[PDB]
Each structure stands twice: as C-alpha cells, then as structure tokens.
Amino acid sequence: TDPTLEWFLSHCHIHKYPSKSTLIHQGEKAETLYYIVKGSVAVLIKDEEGKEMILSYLNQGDFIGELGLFEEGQERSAWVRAKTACEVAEISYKKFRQLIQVNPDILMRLSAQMARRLQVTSEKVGNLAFLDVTGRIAQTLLNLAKQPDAMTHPDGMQIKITRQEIGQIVGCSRETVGRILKMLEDQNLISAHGKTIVVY
Amino acid sequence: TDPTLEWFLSHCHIHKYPSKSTLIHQGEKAETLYYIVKGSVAVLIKDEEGKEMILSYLNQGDFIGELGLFEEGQERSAWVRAKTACEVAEISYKKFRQLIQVNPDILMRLSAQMARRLQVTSEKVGNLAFLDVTGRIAQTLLNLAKQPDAMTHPDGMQIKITRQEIGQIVGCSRETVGRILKMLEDQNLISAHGKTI
Ligand SMILES: Nc1ncnc2c1ncn2[C@@H]1O[C@@H]2COP(=O)(O)O[C@H]2[C@H]1O
Numbered sequence: 001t002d003p004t005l006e007w008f009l010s011h012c013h014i015h016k017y018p019s020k021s022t023l024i025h026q027g028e029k030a031e032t033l034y035y036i037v038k039g040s041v042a043v044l045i046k047d048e049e050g051k052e053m054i055l056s057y058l059n060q061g062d063f064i065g066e067l068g069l070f071e072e073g074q075e076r077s078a079w080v081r082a083k084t085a086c087e088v089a090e091i092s093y094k095k096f097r098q099l100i101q102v103n104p105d106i107l108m109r110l111s112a113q114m115a116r117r118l119q120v121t122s123e124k125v126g127n128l129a130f131l132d133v134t135g136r137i138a139q140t141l142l143n144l145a146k147q148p149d150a151m152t153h154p155d156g157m158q159i160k161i162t163r164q165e166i167g168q169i170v171g172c173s174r175e176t177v178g179r180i181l182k183m184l185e186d187q188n189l190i191s192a193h194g195k196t197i198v199v200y
Numbered sequence: 201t202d203p204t205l206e207w208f209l210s211h212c213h214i215h216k217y218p219s220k221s222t223l224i225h226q227g228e229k230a231e232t233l234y235y236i237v238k239g240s241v242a243v244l245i246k247d248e249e250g251k252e253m254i255l256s257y258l259n260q261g262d263f264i265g266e267l268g269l270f271e272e273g274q275e276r277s278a279w280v281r282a283k284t285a286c287e288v289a290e291i292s293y294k295k296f297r298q299l300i301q302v303n304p305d306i307l308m309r310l311s312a313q314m315a316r317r318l319q320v321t322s323e324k325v326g327n328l329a330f331l332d333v334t335g336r337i338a339q340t341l342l343n344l345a346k347q348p349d350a351m352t353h354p355d356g357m358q359i360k361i362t363r364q365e366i367g368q369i370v371g372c373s374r375e376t377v378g379r380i381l382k383m384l385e386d387q388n389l390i391s392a393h394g395k396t397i
C-alpha cells in the first residue's frame with residue numbers, strides 16, 4: 001500500500017458513477033476535489049453548437065476537479081464524463097487545504113499531474129495550430145500507441161477506439177476520420193480492421 | 201508586500217536579463233525554478249517549419265520553468281524569452297523542495313498559477329478547434345484588453361501589440377492579421393496601437 005494515498009483517502013467519501021454519467025458539469029460551482037479510485041473518464045469542452053472536443057482521458061490514480069482549488073468563487077472549466085463505471089473519492093477544497101499543511105506530499109502529487117496535463121494540452125495547442133487534419137489523426141494514432149491501454153502486436157501496436165472519438169480528439173467529423181484512416185492504410189502507416197487499429 | 205514571497209526570494213539568487221534574451225531553451229535538462237521579480241516574458245513553441253506560437257505571456261509574480269519540478273529527469277517543454285528587460289530569481293529544485301516542507305504556502309502559490317495556466321491553455325485549444333482565424337484574432341484582442349498593460353482609452357481599451365505577435369498567438373501570418381485588422385476597423389472594435397487600428 002501507499003501510506004500517503006491511504007492517509008488521504010481516509011478523509012474522503014467514496015461514491016460510484018455508472019458509465020456515461022457526468023461527474024462534473026462545466027459552469028458548475030467548483031468547491032470539491034476528486035480522485036479516481038477505479039475507472040476512466042473523459043474531460044470535454046464544447047463549441048456554441050454542441051460539437052465536443054476531448055481534452056483528455058483521466059484514469060485510476062488521477063485527480064479531477066483540482067483547478068478551482070487555489071481560488072474560491074471559480075466554476076468548473078470543463079465536463080467530465082465516465083467512460084466506464086467509476087469509483088471516485090471526493091473531499092472539499094477546505095479539508096484538502098488542511099491536509100496540505102499536514103503533509104505537502106499530497107499537493108506535490110496533485111501538482112505533478114497538473115504539470116503533465118499542462119505539457120500535454122500545450123502540445124495539443126501545437127497540433128491544432130500547426131497540423132492539418134491528416135497530421136493530427138496520424139499524430140493521435142501514434143500517441144495512443146504508447147498509452148497504457150495500448151497493447152503489443154506482432155506487426156506493432158494495437159489500440160481500441162472509434163472514429164467518433166478520434167474525431168472529438170482531433171476536431172473533425174467521424175466521416176472525415178473514416179476517410180483519413182483509410183488513406184493512412186494506403187500509405188502503409190496503419191491497418192484498420194474494425195475499431196481496432198494496428199499502427200506500425 | 202508579503203512575508204512568504206520575501207522569505208522565498210531571500211533563498212534565491214536574483215539576476216537581470218536584456219529584452220530579447222532566452223531564459224529557457226526547450227529540451228534542456230530541468231533543475232531550476234524561476235520567479236519573475238521584474239518585467240515580462242513570452243512562452244513559445246515551434247513547428248518543424250520554424251513557425252513560432254505564443255502559448256502565453258507571463259509577468260511579475262509569475263513562476264516559470266516549474267513543470268520539471270515534480271519528477272526527476274525532465275526537460276523544458278518550451279522556450280521562454282524575455283519580452284522586456286527582466287529581473288528573475290532562480291533556485292534549485294532540490295532547495296525548493298525543502299522550502300516546500302518548511303512552509304507549503306509557497307507551493308500553493310506555484311500550483312495556483314499552474315491551475316490558471318491549464319485553464320487558459322485549455323481555452324486556447326477550444327479557440328483553435330472551434331473558431332476561424334477572424335474569430336481568434338477578435339477574441340485575442342478582447343483578451344489583451346484586460347492584461348497588465350492595458351491603457352484606458354476613451355473609446356475603450358488600448359493595447360500595444362505587433363501584427364507578428366498577433367499572428368503567433370492565434371496561429372496565422374502577419375499579412376492575414378493586417379487584412380483582418382483592416383476588416384475589424386471598417387466594422388468596429390479596433391483600439392490597437394501596435395500599428396494603429
Ligand atoms: N486540459 C486539461 N487536461 C486535463 N484535465 C483537464 C483539462 N482541463 C480541465 N481538466 C480537468 O477537468 C476538470 C473540470 O473541472 P475543474 O476545473 O474543477 O478541474 C478540471 C480538471 O480536473
């Protein structure tokens with residue numbers, strides 16, 4: 001076990017969220033912090049007309065809703081949706097702050113995650129500003145081929161994801177994804193036989 | 201001022217930097233945390249064609265080069281360049297990690313900034329994914345119209361920014377900025393002296 005994590009979790013109250021549930025609504029009052037004990041979620045934002053973009057995938061071990069923690073009166077900056085059934089620990093910002101004074105390590109862990117997320121979203125700004133849709137898709141296929149849920153393949157790496165998701169990640173239609181995925185197969189960069197894609 | 205910052209700074213070595221100097225180079229090994237005591241800088245990234253984009257402007261009171269602090273063996277994720285004459289404090293991650301345990305309030309101030317930056321950078325992703333160039337420039341102008349150095353012109357808010365800088369923030373050429381600034385001017389909501397609009 002991890003003494004610090006277990007120490008922290010003992011000050012939290014756990015709850016469950018079924019797949020497709022919305023844990024955090026954008027615009028909502030930020031006053032609580034979350035910690036994914038089990039499961040995975042998606043962090044989403046939207047344009048004026050319902051188009052959704054996935055900012056990130058968070059998983060077991062990741063903190064959520066930390067952005068309103070250092071300043072009161074702030075609202076949630078995005079929507080968080082359960083991809084799979086989730087077990088989440090929740091604690092008020094007030095209590096977490098008291099825990100910080102007790103052992104700063106817990107904030108160091110939270111901050112490390114914030115730093116990673118900043119690095120990743122910054123690279124996201126890069127892809128959106130410098131690459132055409134073909135480049136973003138190809139870059140996203142390579143990215144996923146490194147994540148944990150990524151498997152090993154005799155011809156490379158295998159991943160499980162739908163065209164809709166790819167679209168929400170790179171900012172394009174599922175049909176555009178479908179067409180681009182095929183063109184990348186003709187370029188012998190990947191192999192698409194189902195929602196499973198083999199990347200070389 | 202405040203005891204916490206003075207205390208923190210008393211443990212730092214302060215230095216001055218000319219207006220166009222590079223404080224941080226992307227890819228370098230990270231073992232140093234910086235704090236802007238005076239002046240301002242630009243955070244940048246580049247594409248494989250040399251084109252640069254401004255991820256953010258940082259100013260007095262802002263920590264910089266903090267992303268490599270939470271884990272060993274990390275490299276700078278971007279270039280940080282002074283936009284004006286700077287006065288920057290610095291300190292080893294090793295010694296900062298000790299100050300954190302003596303008084304976590306200093307870590308709270310740094311993390312507070314990381315949070316804001318993540319919100320702002322996430323908003324940048326939205327702008328790039330959902331708005332056309334004209335929309336991005338228009339929003340960028342409104343944004344700058346609240347920044348540190350935003351004059352109080354009678355017709356509204358006055359700012360100072362080059363076409364090139366506008367281009368680097370929204371992601372387009374300075375020629376496209378010029379044309380669109382012209383359009384925004386024929387319509388309205390143009391208070392930039394960067395080049396007069
Ligand atoms: N760019 C991002 N990358 C990862 N997680 C994010 C990003 N933007 C927002 N979030 C998370 O989504 C949450 C939405 O509500 P909060 O602002 O409380 O906290 C936010 C973060 O935990």
Ligand SMILES: Nc1ncnc2c1ncn2[C@@H]1O[C@@H]2COP(=O)(O)O[C@H]2[C@H]1O
Nearest residue numbers: 051052053164167168171172173174329
């Ligand atoms: N610029 C964009 N153009 C089109 N769809 C986008 C864009 N940015 C995000 N999306 C979203 O990504 C989704 C991909 O699958 P859909 O076609 O079902 O719906 C799409 C939109 O919700």
Ligand SMILES: Nc1ncnc2c1ncn2[C@@H]1O[C@@H]2COP(=O)(O)O[C@H]2[C@H]1O
Nearest residue numbers: 256264265266267268276277278317321
């Ligand atoms: N999106 C961003 N917003 C603000 N500052 C950033 C951003 N990305 C990188 N930086 C700064 O640029 C630095 C580059 O790598 P560092 O680890 O030095 O720490 C980073 C931050 O201080």
Ligand SMILES: Nc1ncnc2c1ncn2[C@@H]1O[C@@H]2COP(=O)(O)O[C@H]2[C@H]1O
Nearest residue numbers: 129251252253364367368371372373374
């Ligand atoms: N997608 C892009 N298209 C054009 N210029 C860009 C883009 N992204 C960033 N830039 C930069 O923004 C700068 C604006 O001024 P310049 O035209 O001199 O040079 C431009 C490039 O360096």
